Design a binder for this molecule. Structure first.
Ligand SMILES: N[C@@H](CCC(=O)N[C@@H](CS[C@H](CC=O)c1ccccc1)C(=O)NCC(=O)O)C(=O)O
Ligand SMILES: N[C@@H](CCC(=O)N[C@@H](CS[C@H](CC=O)c1ccccc1)C(=O)NCC(=O)O)C(=O)O
Lengths: 220, 218
């Protein structure tokens, strides 16, 4: 059979959460890197992109576009999306808050430097007073190793990935949240995630301007 | 019965109203009128992220639009029949939500950006989103987007067609199969009742309602 093909460019961007999720499932995948605006145009003209956008993922006979369609399919296929509809609602509620915070962080580099540290200061405030207490409260509520159902789920994977990006932005932001610290350690120590965290994995670095201008030339 | 917590406007709650109505589910709305009433919900712990939309359903206090919709869609069997059908649906509705998001945020755009944003919305409507969804319908020829059966993808898409009509009734004119889907879904019994006067369906957001919103969300 065929292992899934990730079509993006060589950066975190909107593909990284899927890299984390497939790796944590222990699924091997290939990446076909888009290197120019002409590579993007070839995927368009070939009819591979429903909305002429990437992320695109070739899996199980489909060409899935949209971040949330790809992740939902992968999370369901590998039993990381809860056991029932109610657990799914909890998972979805949790991960969509994570998506909201992950979005602000993702779009820090290509905001006008006129507003960067105004935006960054509000990202930091929402972390300390809104998102980090919300999840710490969830972990305190049940005292189990995983956010939902006492079983590893996509919520745990998505949250811990964001914990890493929060650490990159301000390492002190986690310090008053002991249960988030512990989750971060336990999840990072799962053999699949620990491999993915070790060098030479498909995990991607933070975006420098070198790759920000590459993304500028590919997406115009 | 489900209890919808939002303010008296479309906002991020309308697509839930549409989806519940199409599934023939009666609901109550608890309208927020002040920032005071929003803080009542927050301090009472009802909002996980201190935000609405929030829906009381089946014992839970679900915030996040997509958590609400995904749960209602599965409960009332509008999420397809397997995860490959849910993946087609998800790919479709996320395109819809991308365009819907642009339209939802037009009135709150900075006034100097509004001419450009509206032009862009129309360009993507005409060249990206409507051709994408017409090609789906032309590809299998069926009356519904997925599985030859009604699903949330049809409901979300038709809802968005009404917002495109309000913005520019010419935009759908070159897309015959979208037109026919709009009328077919409009004439489904539960949807036809929702579209009629006096339903919970909300109007476009005028000036008064928009500054009601800013006061509530400080
Ligand atoms: N809802 C969808 C959205 C899909 C989407 O916006 N894809 C984009 C590339 S990501 C972006 C590009 C940089 O400027 C970036 C890359 C790095 C950092 C920040 C942003 C794209 O393909 N743009 C082409 C076009 O819109 O025509 C989904 O979640 O999948
Ligand atoms: N990801 C989440 C987001 C939830 C979300 O952003 N809720 C907001 C109200 S909607 C917005 C408010 C107007 O300024 C509006 C309403 C009408 C028109 C345009 C914008 C809220 O509660 N804001 C309080 C706060 O953030 O402190 C979800 O999709 O569910």
């Amino acid at each position: 059979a065929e292992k899934p093909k990730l079509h993006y460019f060589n950066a975190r961007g909107r593909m990284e959460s899927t890299r984390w999720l497939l790796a944590a499932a222990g699924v091997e995948f290939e990446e076909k890197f888009i290197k120019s605006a002409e590579d993007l145009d070839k995927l368009r003209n070939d009819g591979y992109l429903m909305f002429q956008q990437v992320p695109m993922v070739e899996i199980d006979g489909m060409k899935l576009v949209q971040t949330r369609a790809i992740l939902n399919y992968i999370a369901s296929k590998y039993n990381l999306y809860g056991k029932d509809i109610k657990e799914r609602a909890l998972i979805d509620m949790y991960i969509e808050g994570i998506a909201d915070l992950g979005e602000m962080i993702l779009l820090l580099p290509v905001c006008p430097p006129e507003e960067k540290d105004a935006k960054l200061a509000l990202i930091k405030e929402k972390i300390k007073n809104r998102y980090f207490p919300a999840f710490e409260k969830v972990l305190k509520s049940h005292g189990q190793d995983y956010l939902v159902g006492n079983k590893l789920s996509r919520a745990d994977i998505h949250l811990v990935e964001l914990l890493y990006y929060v650490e990159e932005l301000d390492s002190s932001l986690i310090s008053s949240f002991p249960l988030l610290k512990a989750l971060k350690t336990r999840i990072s120590n799962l053999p699949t995630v620990k491999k993915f965290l070790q060098p030479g994995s498909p995990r991607k670095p933070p975006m420098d301007e070198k790759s920000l201008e590459e993304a500028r030339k590919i997406f115009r």
